Amino acid sequence: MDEKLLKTIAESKYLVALTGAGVSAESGIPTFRGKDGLWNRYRPEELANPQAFAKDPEKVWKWYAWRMEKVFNAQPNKAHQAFAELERLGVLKCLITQNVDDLHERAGSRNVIHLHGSLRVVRCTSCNNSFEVESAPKIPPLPKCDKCGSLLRPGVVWFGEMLPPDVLDRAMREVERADVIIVAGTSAVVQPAASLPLIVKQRGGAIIEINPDETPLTPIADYSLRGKAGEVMDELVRHVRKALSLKLN
Numbered sequence: 001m002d003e004k005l006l007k008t009i010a011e012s013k014y015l016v017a018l019t020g021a022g023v024s025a026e027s028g029i030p031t032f033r034g035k036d037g038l039w040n041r042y043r044p045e046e047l048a049n050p051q052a053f054a055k056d057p058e059k060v061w062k063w064y065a066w067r068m069e070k071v072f073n074a075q076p077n078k079a080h081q082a083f084a085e086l087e088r089l090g091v092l093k094c095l096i097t098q099n100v101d102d103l104h105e106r107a108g109s110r111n112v113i114h115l116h117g118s119l120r121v122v123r124c125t126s127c128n129n130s131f132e133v134e135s136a137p138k139i140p141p142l143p144k145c146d147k148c149g150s151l152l153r154p155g156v157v158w159f160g161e162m163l164p165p166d167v168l169d170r171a172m173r174e175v176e177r178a179d180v181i182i183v184a185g186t187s188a189v190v191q192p193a194a195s196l197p198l199i200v201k202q203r204g205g206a207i208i209e210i211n212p213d214e215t216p217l218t219p220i221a222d223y224s225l226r227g228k229a230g231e232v233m234d235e236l237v238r239h240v241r242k243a244l245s246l247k248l249n
């Protein structure tokens, strides 16, 4: 939290952010990897891939319905609140997230790109049709599409599946013009999301990493803050807001 970092943020021309599961950990939602990560307790091979869904849609749906309830009942934390505020202040231009929760939105963030989909969305496996839900469905029975008599599935991106072209292209455009990118709460291993911060660096921008652990991105991060996103972002945005308020205008 040195003056150099604060200056980089407060004076940025087009700051964007990329967030991962770590930004929602302080909301009581576990992450995917690490200590008590979901992929350490559960097997992604039976829950997060098209083959697993086709093999046992009931098992996959029961798990996602559980995750949905957990997310819908959770509250945004200080990190989510801080990103929303950084956007309100006119500093953060776009928030790109790998998270399938809607905590960024519930905290007030407006320009959000969901690279991996959302637990709020459910769609048909047959016809190209989707819609959002207010609460989690009960499983069984299997959620069915009332547009062609087929199965509905969680509107999230599974391993091996292609991220929607329009979504990734938009995110790509955002990082192509960003001069600063805050990368918070992500392990930087899952592609193509992990490649986004590299674009910023290759084009001449700065990377500000926020994570209690070091990651594959750490070596090229201009700044790498070892701490929880809630604490770090709250302090960072408060200092940025203060700095901006001091400007003679």
Ligand SMILES: Nc1ncnc2c1ncn2[C@@H]1O[C@H](COP(=O)(O)OP(=O)(O)OC[C@H]2O[C@H](O)[C@H](O)[C@@H]2O)[C@@H](O)[C@H]1O
Pocket: 019, 020, 021, 022, 023, 025, 026, 031, 032, 033, 034, 037, 098, 099, 116, 184, 185, 186, 187, 188, 189, 190, 210, 211, 212, 213, 215, 227, 228, 229, 230
């Ligand atoms: N309070 C916290 N504040 C900031 N970061 C934290 C916090 N707590 C944990 N982290 C960090 O969050 C990171 C989470 O890494 P992942 O669990 O791999 O989450 P993510 O990078 O978003 O996963 C990417 C993708 O893979 C999953 O299969 C899924 O599709 C997901 O979107 C870890 O590096 C971890 O150290």
Ligand SMILES: [Zn+2]
Pocket: 124, 125, 126, 127, 128, 129, 145, 146, 147, 148, 149, 150
């Ligand atoms: Zn359908």
